[PDB]
Amino acid sequence: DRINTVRGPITISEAGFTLTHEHICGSSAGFLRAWPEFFGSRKALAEKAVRGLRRARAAGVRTIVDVSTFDIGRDVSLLAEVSRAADVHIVAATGLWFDPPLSMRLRSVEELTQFFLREIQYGIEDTGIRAGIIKVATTGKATPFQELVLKAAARASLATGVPVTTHTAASQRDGEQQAAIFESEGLSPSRVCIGHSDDTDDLSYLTALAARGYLIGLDHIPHSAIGLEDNASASALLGIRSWQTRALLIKALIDQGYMKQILVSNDWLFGFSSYVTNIMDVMDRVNPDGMAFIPLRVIPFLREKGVPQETLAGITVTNPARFLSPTLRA
Amino acid sequence: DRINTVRGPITISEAGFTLTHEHICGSSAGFLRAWPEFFGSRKALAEKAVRGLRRARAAGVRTIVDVSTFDIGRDVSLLAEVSRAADVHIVAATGLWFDPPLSMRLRSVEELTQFFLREIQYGIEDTGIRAGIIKVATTGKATPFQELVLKAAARASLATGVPVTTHTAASQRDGEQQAAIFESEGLSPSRVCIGHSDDTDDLSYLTALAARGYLIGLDHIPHSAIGLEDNASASALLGIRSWQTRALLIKALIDQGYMKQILVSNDWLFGFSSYVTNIMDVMDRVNPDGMAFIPLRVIPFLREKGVPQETLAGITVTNPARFLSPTLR
Ligand SMILES: CCOP(=O)(Cc1ccc(C)cc1)OCC
Ligand SMILES: CCOP(=O)(Cc1ccc(C)cc1)OCC
Asked: I need a labelling partner for B93 at 20 to 30 A (CA). Which of A18, A74, A133, B76 fits?
């Protein structure tokens, strides 16, 4: 029935057009509070985010899922304020990414489970704001710690009904190892979204996961250093495949009958401290439409390539509603 | 003239007996706010700290230096509240230890200098509370990033007069490489305290740095896993040297004419999430006196060993005052 947002619970019908993998800011635990000037100022950052969210809203976007975890420097008060100002629903996350501090790294699977449930049931910090999704990540073979995270995510998800979303090194087929772990925990593939999936050209790897019931996240659409090949850091981060190439993978899965398994996003942000300095400048040049890139550019492109409008609606409205809706096992 | 504390500035005379390397809680950036229950509750942690601090105060302690950096999970609001409640002065720190997040790891020396100056001049977070010391760390051969930290710490120190205090792998003689970098930045050894120095028996190493004008921090006095050796984790962390063995290093240095360069502490805490679970329990059992260990146990021991009381007063009152006073070159 309900999905938790930074402003409280909403009905499924209110979610509307939803972007499933985004961020307001990409940072580190405690960073925004300790060194806000890094982003100009907190106020500057929020203003930027409000502007961008209002542009997306104008394009039809009603809800965004900010997959920033504790270690991505998620600031739930920042999220609640921009959500309120832009009038865009924002779903917050729990989980752990690739930069856990010692206090997290030394924890057992049981303790991590506890922390995840806490964020989901009790709320984040002392705000009472509850997480609506669990974010995990691997980059190649899972380290022993990552395996604990994955198990903990599965158990919290089994207890709550809240979905799991991941970061993958698609090219290395991480999705298959993640699936194996999740399944070993009893987790249903339909509660899981294997992200950054458009980062690969191997459709066989994709279709195989889709066939198992997993959701495939094609969330790096606008990421391309194409024409920027002169920037080591940019090219390393964004890649050299064109946005068109990534978008056609959406059509490809549709064509194979997996429309119900597709989730699309931009993986955008408004501030980014966990990388080289001034990186935002480059991204903003690369994708001036920011989070509105999907509705403004991708939808129309697909339409033109022959994808029927309703299919497009099912992908951006229906699939996400199903995914987000907390669902308990048999 | 004045030293910055979490409740504001104090004059040097007001510092009195000062513990130079301690912590209220050993954690990680954002952890306390995100998972306070890991420590029972924020309240419980706070109550535990107030009692401990009141007990040290009863023993004569007037000021403590909490060397918790951003990456140690320093919560200045927590510090301000326990300080007020126990009536003990608390000096806060800036710097970086060994668990910096990516957002910090990717910064240049210039950016890091700016961040340290911010905490010292403008204040921590939005509190307006200013740091009165810079904490840095190495663990054997410095890493490239650690070299950047040390240089930025040096620069912030040269611009503000605030001292620098370090964590070393004493056994590995880290202090030597630290000194080299600081000196390469033009920093006076007298603005530096090389910590965890009682972690080693090498007096040759210690008198060498002392002879150079550096302050020697003997702050692991009560750390010992003797009898607790059935515990790998505790042993790894505490070592197997007795507190008396560490305490005698103090007497040794005094004997060599380095009384003015010694700074003693306990390196205690009331919460500890950055290690194995339940480690506190073990520590509390090893040193039930907590921060009062120094005045209750060490001072009398040294006295009994022949050290003059006045000397003891110089080490615990005079030395720290001089070290802490912001001093420009
Ligand atoms: C099904 C009718 O679309 P929708 O409910 C949400 C929606 C808006 C824009 C696009 C491109 C797709 C979906 O329209 C809102 C006014
Ligand atoms: C000179 C007298 O020391 P002091 O100023 C601070 C002080 C107290 C106790 C000990 C063990 C050392 C130093 O005593 C005030 C109570």
From this structure: A74
